[PDB]
Amino acid sequence: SEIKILSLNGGGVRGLFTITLLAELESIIEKREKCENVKIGDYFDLITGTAIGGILALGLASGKSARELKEAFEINATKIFPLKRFKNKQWWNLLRRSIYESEPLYDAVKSMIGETIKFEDLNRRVMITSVNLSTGKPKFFKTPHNPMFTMDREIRLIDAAMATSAAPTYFKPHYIEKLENYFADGGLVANNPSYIGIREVLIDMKNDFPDAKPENIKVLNIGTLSEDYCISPETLSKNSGKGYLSLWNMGERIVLSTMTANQHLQRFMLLREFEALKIEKNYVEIDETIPNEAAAEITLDNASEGCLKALRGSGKKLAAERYTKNEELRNFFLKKAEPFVPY
Amino acid sequence: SEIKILSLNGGGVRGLFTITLLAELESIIEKREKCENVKIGDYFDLITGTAIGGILALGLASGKSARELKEAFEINATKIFPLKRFKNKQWWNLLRRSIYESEPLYDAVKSMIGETIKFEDLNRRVMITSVNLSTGKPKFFKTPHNPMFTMDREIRLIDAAMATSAAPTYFKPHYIEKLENYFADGGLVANNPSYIGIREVLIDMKNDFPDAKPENIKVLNIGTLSEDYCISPETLSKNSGKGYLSLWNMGERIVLSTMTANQHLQRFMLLREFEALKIEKNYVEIDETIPNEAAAEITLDNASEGCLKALRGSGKKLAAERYTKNEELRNFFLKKAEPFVPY
Amino acid sequence: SEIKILSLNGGGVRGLFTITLLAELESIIEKREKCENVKIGDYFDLITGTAIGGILALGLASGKSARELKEAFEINATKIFPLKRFKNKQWWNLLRRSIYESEPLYDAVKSMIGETIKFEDLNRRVMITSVNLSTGKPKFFKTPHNPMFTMDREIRLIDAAMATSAAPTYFKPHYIEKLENYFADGGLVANNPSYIGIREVLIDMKNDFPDAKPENIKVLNIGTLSEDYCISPETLSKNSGKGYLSLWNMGERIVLSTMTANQHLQRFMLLREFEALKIEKNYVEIDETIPNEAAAEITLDNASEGCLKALRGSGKKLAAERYTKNEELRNFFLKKAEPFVPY
Amino acid sequence: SEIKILSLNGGGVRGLFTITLLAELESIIEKREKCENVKIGDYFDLITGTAIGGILALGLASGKSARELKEAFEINATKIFPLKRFKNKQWWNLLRRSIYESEPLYDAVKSMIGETIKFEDLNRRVMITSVNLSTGKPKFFKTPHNPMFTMDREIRLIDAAMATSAAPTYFKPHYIEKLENYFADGGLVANNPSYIGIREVLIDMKNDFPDAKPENIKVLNIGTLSEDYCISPETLSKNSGKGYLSLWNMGERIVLSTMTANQHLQRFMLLREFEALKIEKNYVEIDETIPNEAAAEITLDNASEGCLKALRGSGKKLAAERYTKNEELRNFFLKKAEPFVPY
């Protein structure tokens, strides 16, 4: 009759906005409905995540409230992105090794989600998009909502969270000993896992949803302050005939353009499809754009207190504003989603 | 009742195998059906391509036969990719400028379709993929099959052909005066234009085909011998803790993994969508992998005198083999496609 | 039955985006309707402008098309904003004189609309916002659509255009000899004249339209690529306890915050009023934020060939996209507005 | 039906006139009606405020008499504006840090309404206009007269009152912990909160007042001895080609002209709208202008004993005169306003 999907983009530190918006939404539901022990993850039949959105997707899927994840986000964000290595993000340090370390990231998820629970212990469906560097193909960690799935049942949620967050430059690739393969972010293939989220319900979650059409699918995509990347007009008009050193500075501009264009495309097919069935209102996207002055400050991995306050303030402001105006946002929390019982 | 789509990937010189397979298919139809001057582009309701696939798609839709395109490819490939520039791909050359030149590529396209034909003159539907470097969004050049289109009616086909083939490293970005925006290769987004080709029929081509569903859509994807790129196990295991210089070589590994993973993802989406719909013979894919001992010679920008023969030999071989075996391949050419008359 | 208002924001060189969007909006109408010498000012019952939007508003009401105004914009942009003045914008050249001579701007307006035409020689209603520096009140130059108007019937249009474009820091205040009062930029009061444009139709324009309500009013607000200004979170967090030199650098932050908030405020009451009456579709806004990379290049007074291409390219792109999607945008140009007969 | 709005303008210590006039009006109602315990806030259905007007608006809406607010105004004015800081307003002190301190202002507000009352506790509707420096948009703190409001309900009144009084040059920006956003004076967008007051009754307060029209809306805008700021005719004539040293005297003249022009504009559209329906009597404005020699002493932050007497004397003088003459002023205090109960 109705299927609700929560999609979280990958934004690193900017995932604080993703969790602050969800945490602020939890308090609004409790205050207005006079209830208690409200978890944002109980209203969604599928929770899709990618990069830092994947880590929050696993936390909500297990059963933790967004406020608890938000509390762990604040203390851990400084440890995950120390200021000693943020200032050393220059050429010869990057040319020698990846910045930061995976151990602070590993410990943060361990307290957040655990170190033993696997996908077969989850009562909520989840997707953790990632790419397999060993084979070159994208590998999507997910709960066995398909009865015939025999691969992701006994991985461990911490392995999926570490795999999708192992940024190609910001972190070392994550080795899963169970799979004997190395992994990287799902943002390389889908920074906005909202289109692929709709696909899974249509073709794979048929045991639970025998008749699933896009009209009965509602998507609540919470962005991470999506940056609209583009090459500067002066560089394009002046350095078009150059190469690498001037245009496409090292590999940076090629991948960032590749990520942004791919991210835009998946959103475009998501948008283009919905107007075809005239059901655009089913897609609720809650995201904004960083102002130019704030854009140079709020980066992917900036843990400074000033920008952390800005991310928290943006999430609190957007959550309250969109709840008042967007009626479709309020419809996600009218009823609790049925728990996922593996077949 | 039936919709046919031709999808062509991007491989550079390896696109000769795409046109050699189409050229040999044209001769087979003439020999068996006892006809003359058959056009391989007259049996498709929509022709979509990327990079070298886009140039071939534009040429086929303009009315030029695949055999004419085949002989044009042979002579021009030595000019588009000169031996002196191919041999001079040192790091300092790529760091100083872009290898190869855009002038020889411009002449090859001009000699085949012209320099004045626009998308409004074509009698065959066309979908060309490109990346708008000025904005970051993917721009898809197309004929006005949807009457509401008001952007691409007066852009020359040579402008779209040069834009989609503008490889980020192997060519300078193509500047379109009619749009004042710079463009890069369409292979950064949709190197396999198979999934997006079906989407256009179900979204934008609703005028000619009102009741269009994937069950009535047959896709003939002709690959360009694309290798399954992956990071070597020795480099992954030995250098997972390094950066740029060792792991993610400068930027090539990050970009190359991103393209193949996205290309895999779009291919996977098509396969998964078709598998669920219990029809898979609709997707006729004719592609192969280069043997390891021959993969070091057949490069996307290497022509030589043997690689020309090797790609041509594969095209003639695969055209005859799949025609004899794949029954659904023969069903593509059983009837000519209706002409595209813009509304 | 229906009243159409065209609102033009002020952005300096960014008005080239405003005129490029209007230029190809004329071209699309000329194509699809198969007409010639189309005038975009004939479809609007009232044209409202501010700063560079005011100059273009006066030109369109003279009976001239947007394409002719666009051609003069390109040649005069490098003349109104010389590169030598652009490079020398330090504090010593800003505290000693206004930067950018006013004569080059004078000739550009003179060469297009003339030098002797007055507000009584206009067949289209006009609103031009300005700040009367001598009295500290907003002075709104407008055609005598109110029959009791006896103030600006004999003032040259070049004086109103020169007054509304006098940016307080860039262009020195414009002395109107007919009124003996000095004037400054009209963007200090209403940088988005969309809201005040509706007020004029309801309050003063009661002779041409006796029964005017916001329900029967359609507004086509063409933006100026305006940036949503805000103080950087790093500066607010660390330097909120300081004054002037650190926070509110000299005075730039106070004026920019005051103008941006006021522009936001007037935009907000426009949205709230239309939301209350369920006529949100009547307000058609065509604007787009500049990316962070492009923001450092597309400033308010940069007329470099790279920035001009981007502003022209954005206008070219937006005009075609919005025409295809926004049906309400197409409905503006269905019929020509009756000419304004002064009374 | 009838709807009464009380609007209080900002200005700092000149708000003593605003509270003295309200205090004298309270005593007049007691004396002529022969009653006791008269609250001036019980006769208005909405109280709009800004800067010192907003602080008084919160106090009146809390339920406290104007005389009680007036008594604390005289005692706290000296500590809020100490003479040592008032005389030390040289450029080298303003260029280093903001004049005055917000701690005495914090205690003065705390001693009046408290430190724990929130917008959900108020029985009277209220506005608090402010500028969100972190985002650039204007934020309007208000009681939940709209049942869908979810943001300001749990915000302490002392935070909103301190936000609207944060004059950009005089008081440091107020950092709200609950919102993680910095705020500035609300007089940057509305020094005269009268026009926006009428809008709310027609837009947000549609639940308590379904059939609300500007005809049934009566406004009592109490001024703050507002000065009609303008640039000196000698300066505009002698120095019109200079910049930022002789003209604009740094940034002070630009912000002052922008603030006064915006304040003039909002009053202008208020008068124009009321004049349109011939209901100009609905707007009762009780304000005057300081004489030229007196204005050199009575500033926005002058807490001298002589200046306080003049402001108190003017409030007592105007309260008796306007009550005698203005019949519409007497009609305000004829029936107590219905208390506001949140839904």
Ligand SMILES: Nc1nc2c(ncn2[C@@H]2O[C@@H]3COP(=O)(O)O[C@H]4[C@@H](O)[C@H](n5cnc6c(N)ncnc65)O[C@@H]4COP(=O)(O)O[C@H]3[C@H]2O)c(=O)[nH]1
């Ligand atoms: N994800 C997953 N696959 C499983 C599991 N058990 C068995 N499998 C099988 O392994 C194949 C490859 O898995 P992958 O995640 O490595 O590649 C996936 C992933 O790269 C991509 N994909 C998966 N779900 C997707 C989705 N919803 N949208 C877009 N792409 C998606 O398509 C590939 C093929 O999916 P498939 O369902 O045809 O084949 C599965 C599936 O049949 C299991 O527990 N999880």
Ligand SMILES: Nc1nc2c(ncn2[C@@H]2O[C@@H]3COP(=O)(O)O[C@H]4[C@@H](O)[C@H](n5cnc6c(N)ncnc65)O[C@@H]4COP(=O)(O)O[C@H]3[C@H]2O)c(=O)[nH]1
């Ligand atoms: N491509 C194109 N768009 C046109 C044309 N005339 C008007 N438009 C409009 O411009 C918009 C953006 O064009 P784009 O091709 O640069 O971006 C496109 C392209 O990046 C992508 N896209 C379009 N068709 C697609 C498809 N079939 N499959 C996958 N992605 C597709 O989605 C974007 C939005 O498509 P849309 O149809 O909603 O909006 C169009 C469309 O309404 C025209 O001739 N071509």
Ligand SMILES: Nc1nc2c(ncn2[C@@H]2O[C@@H]3COP(=O)(O)O[C@H]4[C@@H](O)[C@H](n5cnc6c(N)ncnc65)O[C@@H]4COP(=O)(O)O[C@H]3[C@H]2O)c(=O)[nH]1
């Ligand atoms: N603009 C204008 N005013 C004229 C003219 N002939 C006589 N007047 C009178 O001069 C007054 C002040 O003009 P202004 O433009 O300097 O200030 C104007 C302008 O600052 C503002 N205003 C006018 N129309 C507006 C509008 N539609 N939206 C917002 N603000 C507006 O309100 C002020 C008072 O308008 P009003 O119509 O009550 O009084 C006019 C009007 O009665 C005339 O030809 N033009």
Ligand SMILES: Nc1nc2c(ncn2[C@@H]2O[C@@H]3COP(=O)(O)O[C@H]4[C@@H](O)[C@H](n5cnc6c(N)ncnc65)O[C@@H]4COP(=O)(O)O[C@H]3[C@H]2O)c(=O)[nH]1
């Ligand atoms: N003021 C307010 N807004 C709330 C509250 N709870 C949710 N909201 C929502 O937040 C939006 C932005 O609030 P803001 O005060 O920061 O910006 C406001 C303020 O800058 C301005 N505004 C509001 N009422 C106004 C009014 N009466 N007159 C003039 N401007 C007004 O318009 C903006 C958008 O108002 P809106 O009602 O469409 O959207 C609200 C509203 O839907 C709440 O408790 N108070």
